[PDB]
């Protein structure tokens, strides 16, 4: 939908990422593997949990109807009573539906940016050092092991440590050597 | 019947008494918490 990610360029979610809502998958000399981003799932849960309790709180003053008894020749205020309570019970039933319909749209879109903002986070760290492969995934120039994955995972990668390594690879898969 | 519940809503009977959820003329009321699902 709105933000571009879920059901977007990242075609399909993974069943293998069991521990959390968004996360990482890597592939290197040592292993392959999935790893949920807890930090940012835990932040998304905070926000959904708050949404759920938001509603609950908002409908404790909602219209309570205790009944009234009515006569044979009071028929037309008996009705007035019935028109009212049926009235309010329609107005609050509408409200409770529409709010859900509205919050559900907002919630599914909340995940949609959650994912994308993660990706763009990874992207802004790894710059020239990696290829944007265009399907949710990056391949590095410099070859990056497990300890170095973590840094990307926990957002403290170091560009100017693998620079040469990487830009020796850029330098060459640019066919620039091929003139000597 | 009495209701023993913490849900914010119900659809049994409008003329409750006690500390209740709040009647709604609906028969299904389900929020999303997670992301859109799929096979890959």
């Amino acid at each position: 939908g709105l933000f571009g990610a879920i059901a977007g360029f990242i075609e399909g979610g993974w069943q293998g990422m069991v521990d959390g809502w968004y996360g990482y998958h890597h592939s290197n000399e040592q292993g392959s593997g999935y790893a949920a981003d807890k930090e940012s799932t835990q932040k998304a849960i905070d926000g959904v949990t708050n949404k759920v309790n938001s509603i609950i709180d908002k409908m404790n003053t909602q219209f309570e109807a205790v009944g009234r008894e009515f006569n044979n020749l009071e028929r037309r205020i008996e009705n007035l009573n019935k028109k009212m309570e049926d009235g309010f019970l329609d107005v609050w039933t509408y409200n409770a539906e529409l709010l859900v319909l509205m919050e559900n749209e907002r919630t599914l879109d909340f995940h949609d940016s959650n994912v994308k903002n993660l990706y763009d986070k990874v992207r802004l760290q790894l710059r020239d050092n990696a290829k944007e492969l265009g399907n949710g995934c990056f391949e590095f120039y410099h070859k990056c092991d497990n300890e170095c994955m973590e840094s990307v995972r926990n957002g403290t990668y170091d560009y100017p440590q693998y620079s040469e390594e990487a830009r020796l690879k850029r330098e060459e898969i640019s066919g620039v050597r091929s003139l000597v | 019947g009495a209701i023993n519940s913490s849900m914010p809503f119900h659809n049994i009977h409008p003329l409750t008494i006690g500390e209740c959820p709040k009647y709604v003329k609906s028969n299904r009321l389900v929020l999303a918490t997670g992301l859109r699902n799929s096979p890959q």
Partner: single-chain antibody, 236 residues
Framework: QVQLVQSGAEVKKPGSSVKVSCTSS????????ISWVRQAPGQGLEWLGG????????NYAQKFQGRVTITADQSTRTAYMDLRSLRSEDTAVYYC?????????????????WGQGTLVTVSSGIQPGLTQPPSVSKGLRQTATLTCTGN????????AAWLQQHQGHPPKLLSY???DRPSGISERFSASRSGNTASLTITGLQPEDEADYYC???????????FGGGTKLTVL
């Protein structure tokens, strides 16, 4: 307040199984990870394992690894603990703890609320991970300092959260991983950590303060929650 209510006081014989239960009041229970911690008569706390209700994935301690299987039933706000081939030294009270963490898998997992306690007695036919001294005694209206030492796979890195336990009740939470105190707790109780040792200092000592206090966190090497020995504070 949220309620956690636990199974009755089951009594089993050697080698058999148990299925203890625990049930959460909060409608939003799907998003707070639930643990199962036990303590046997006159001893301290031991983390069996925990579950995230949202995702189904449980974490256990090596100790019980293949012989304890905890699962949550989203549908009915109910977390199940059951252990197999149960013998004698499993005679314990089985408490039931919620964490504001959605999964129980790191220093985030600290226990804010506890169930009442399910007693299990095996009718016939322990070694802690953190350092607390066993007793500290301090006069009325003074200041106490309770310490918890660990290494670096735990306190050094994850932080360390404190717990109070009165003879007979379950333990209230005094501090979060990150030094912050929760609602009920008086400004008298100040948590702090410096490096590899964690210390909770209590000012203005009053008769109530006298109980057993536990610190706890996650150990990176054991992939498990770890409690300290417990320290009984007296006052008069």
């Amino acid at each position: 307040q949220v309620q956690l209510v636990q199974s009755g006081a089951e009594v089993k014989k050697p080698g058999s199984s148990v299925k203890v239960s625990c049930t959460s009041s909060e409608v939003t229970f799907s998003s707070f990870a639930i643990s199962w911690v036990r303590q046997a008569p006159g001893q301290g706390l031991e983390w069996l394992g925990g579950i995230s209700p949202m995702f189904g994935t449980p974490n256990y301690a090596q100790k019980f690894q293949g012989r304890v299987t905890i699962t949550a039933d989203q549908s009915t706000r109910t977390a199940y603990m059951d252990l197999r081939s149960l013998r004698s030294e499993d005679t314990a009270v089985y408490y039931c703890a919620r964490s504001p963490s959605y999964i129980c898998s790191g220093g985030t997992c600290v226990f804010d609320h506890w169930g009442q306690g399910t007693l299990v007695t095996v009718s016939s036919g322990i070694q802690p991970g953190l350092t607390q001294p066993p007793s500290v005694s301090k006069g009325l209206r003074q200041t106490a300092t309770l310490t918890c030492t660990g290494n670096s796979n735990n306190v050094g890195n994850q932080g360390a959260a404190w717990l109070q336990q009165h003879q007979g009740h379950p333990p209230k939470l005094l501090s979060y991983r990150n030094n912050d105190r929760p609602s009920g707790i008086s400004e008298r109780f100040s948590a702090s950590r410096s490096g590899n040792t964690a210390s909770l200092t209590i000012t203005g000592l009053q008769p109530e303060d006298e109980a057993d206090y536990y610190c706890s966190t996650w150990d990176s090497s054991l992939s498990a929650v770890v409690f300290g020995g417990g320290t009984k504070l007296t006052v008069l």
